[model samples]
Target: AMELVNIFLETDAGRVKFVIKNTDDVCASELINKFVELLSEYIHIDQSEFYLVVKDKDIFYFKCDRGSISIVNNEFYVFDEPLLFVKDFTKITGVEFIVTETMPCRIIPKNNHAVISVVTNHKFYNGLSLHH
Candidate 1:
C-alpha cells in the first residue's frame, strides 16, 4: 500500500505542508519538481528559480557527503541517523532516507534578491529542523 508523506515546505512566506506520494521508485528529483510547483503557486516565481533544503538544527545545509537518503523496495529509509535531510533542487544528489512524521524541507531561491522578495514576515519557523 502507498502512503502520503508530509513535505514541510519551509518558506519565508511561512511553513507550508506540501503532501507527496511515498513510493519505492520515486526519485528525489521528482519530489523537488513537485515542491517547486507548489511553491510557485504562492510566491509567483519561475519554475527553475528555486532550490530545496533540509534544515539541520538551526542551519540549512545539504547532505553532500553520503548522498542523503535511500529508497528500498516500497519503503524509504535514511542511513544518516537523525538528520535534517534538506535537498537542493539544482542538484539531485541527496534525499532523506529516513522516514519521519513530517519531512521538513525549504524552497529557497537561487539569487539573494529573490530572498528579499519572499521575506515579508519573520516568524520563527519552530521545531523539527532536528539533528542527530
Candidate 2:
C-alpha cells in the first residue's frame, strides 16, 4: 500500500493544503501533483513552468509529469511572479514532502513569508508542507 500524506503548500497564491499518496522516489512529485490538482479548482493553471534556485536558477515545466522528483538540497526557492505564483526549488527545490518532511515549494515576493517545519508521522503528524 502507498503512504498517503496530508501536506500544506504555501506560495504567492496562498496555502494549498492536501494529501499525497504513492511510494515513488522522493515523493515530492506526489505533493506537487496534489498542489496542482487543488489549485486548478479555484485558479486556472496558466503558470506551468518553475525554477530551481541553487546559486543559480534553472527552469522546468510542471504539467503532469508523475516521474521522479529531485530533492537536491535542504533549501530551495523560486522568485518569479508567475512561476512563484505556482511552484518550488534545486534542480528540483523544496522537494521535501512526507509525514515528516517539507516541500519548500515556492518563494513569494513579499506577503509576509510563511515557513516550514518537518517531522514525519502518519498518525501523529497531521499535515505535510511545501514552499513556492
Candidate 3:
C-alpha cells in the first residue's frame, strides 16, 4: 500500500504545499531527494546551495538522511505555526526588531517606521518579543 506525505514551504508570492506518495519501505533520504528535486522544478530552489529548514517553537533542519516521513508529519502537526522552508539568505530577515530604551519590537514597516496599526494586527508584540 501507499502512504501520502505533505511538505510545506513559504516563499515570495505563495506558499508551497508539496504532496508525495510512497510505500512504507522507502528510505527517508530517498524521499528527501524527491523533495529536493521537486523544489527545483516547482520553485527553482537548488538543494546543493540551500537546505531544508522547518520552524516550530524554534528552528531546525529537516535533514534528508536522518528521519522518516511519519516523524516529519507528526512534527509538522506539533507546531501551531506553519512550516517555513528557508535558505541561508532567507533566514537573515527572519527576525525583525525596533529599538527603544525601554523595550524592542519586530515587524513589516512602511517608510522605515513600524506601523503600530499593522504590527499589532499580526499579534507578535503581544507575545514575548517577536521572532519573525
Candidate 4:
C-alpha cells in the first residue's frame, strides 16, 4: 500500500518545513509509479494533475529541499508544505523529461545546475534498464 506524504509550499521567505513519509525512493521507476498513482487520484478530485514524461536520456535527478522540489531539468517546482502539486515538466518548459545516468545531464539546459553528494551507495534502478 502507498501513503500520502506531506505537501510543501513555496514562500518568498524560503522553504517551509513539514513532516511526511519520505516516500522518495532513489529508484526512478518506483518514483514514477508512485507519482502516477498519486496524480491519478489527485486529478480525479482537482482536475489539475497532468501527465509528465521524463524523456529518455534527458532526466538527471530530482531533489527535495524542505518545501521545494527542484529537478535537474533546469526547472524548479515549488510546492505547498504537504508537496501535493504534480504536473508535467513539459507544461513548464517545452522540453520533455528524459532519463539518463551521467554527470552534467546532457538534455537539461546548460544553465541548470546540480549539486552532487557522496554517501554510502544505495542499490537502486537507474531507469535505463526498464523495458517500458
Candidate 5:
C-alpha cells in the first residue's frame, strides 16, 4: 500500500490521469491529506498495542498514544476490508480511501511521456455496483 503511494508521487506530468472516483461525496484532496498525516504518525509509533475483547463475539482494536495525542478505535467485521473501512472512516474524518479493482482502459501507456500526451475526462462512482 505504501509502495502504491510512492508510485503515485513519482510522476508529475499534467496530462497523466489519476482516475480516483471520489465516493467520499467530498474532496479526495482533504481525505488524502488526513490519511497521510495519520500514516506518518502510525509509522513513528512502534509500540502500538493490539488487543481483543469478547462477550458474544470476537472484537479487535488497536491503541496508540504519543506525547500529545491518543487514539483508540475498534475494528468490527466490516472494517476488515481496507477500502470499505476507509470509506466509512472518511465520513468520520474528511477523506476515504478509493480503489479501482479493474481498469476499463484498453491501452496501457508505454511510458510517462505517453501519459503526458493524453487528456482524460473526469468521472464519478454514483452508487455503482462495480467501479470498473
Candidate 6:
C-alpha cells in the first residue's frame, strides 16, 4: 500500500521548507508512533499533553498545545499551533496527505479497477441546478 503524506514548515523568509517523509514499509499504526517520536525529539512539547488518533481509513490526525499533525496512508502532515497560519499545508510542506473530499482523485484499485467521474458545471457552481 502506497500513500503519500508530505510535511513542510513555514520559514521567516516567507518560504516553506520540506521536513520529512514517512515511507518505510510500515503500517499506519507504526508510522504514527514513529512520527510522534520524531516530532517530540525536535520540538518541545509535553508528551503527556500531546495526543493523536486515526480519523478514518489510514488517516491519523494529532494535536498538541503548539500545533497539529495529520497522517494519511503512510505520510505525515504538520501544522502550526494557530490553525489560520497556513491555508495549504501541502504548499508549506512538501507532503500531500490525502484529503477526504479529494481521495477519489488519487485512488486506483488493483484487482477491481474503476473510473468514477464527477462533473462540476457552471450551473452547480452558481446554484442554478441542484439536480443533474
lDDT tens per residue, model 5, 16-87: 111233334643322333333443422332322211111113222222232123222432223222211111
What does candidate 4's lDDT look like per residue over 1-132, in tens digits? 222222222233332322224544444434544443433321221322222323222332443322233453523222112323332222121122222232122222222222122122222455555454
TM-score ranking of the models: 3, 6, 1, 2, 4, 5
- Taking every candidate in turn, the Cα RMSD to the unseen true structure, in Å, is 13.8, 15.1, 13.4, 15.5, 18.1, 15.8
lDDT of 6 by residue, 7-106 (tens): 2233233333222354546555555555555444333434223334342234554433333444434223232222222323332211222232322223
Every candidate's lDDT: 0.32, 0.32, 0.33, 0.29, 0.24, 0.34
> In model 6, which runs have C-alpha deviations exceeding 4 angstroms?
1-8, 15-24, 51-58, 62-132
Worst 10 residues of 6 by lDDT: 115-124
Best by lDDT: 6
| Model 3 lDDT, residue 14, Cα | 35
User: For model 5, where is the 10-residue window of minimal lDDT?
Assistant: 1-10
lDDT of 2 at 22: 43
lDDT digits (tens) for residues 56-99 of candidate 1: 22212122212232222221222223224333333222122222
Error at 82, model 1, angstroms: 12
Residue-by-residue lDDT tens digits, candidate 3, 26-130: 644345556556544333232222234333223333433221222222222222334344332331111121122222222232223212210112222333665
TM-scores vs. true structure, each candidate: 0.29, 0.24, 0.31, 0.22, 0.17, 0.29
Under the 3 Å rule for N, CA and C atoms, how many clashes does model 6 have?
Answer: 6
Q: Candidate 4 at residue 40, lDDT?
A: 33
Residue 36 C-alpha lDDT in model 4: 39
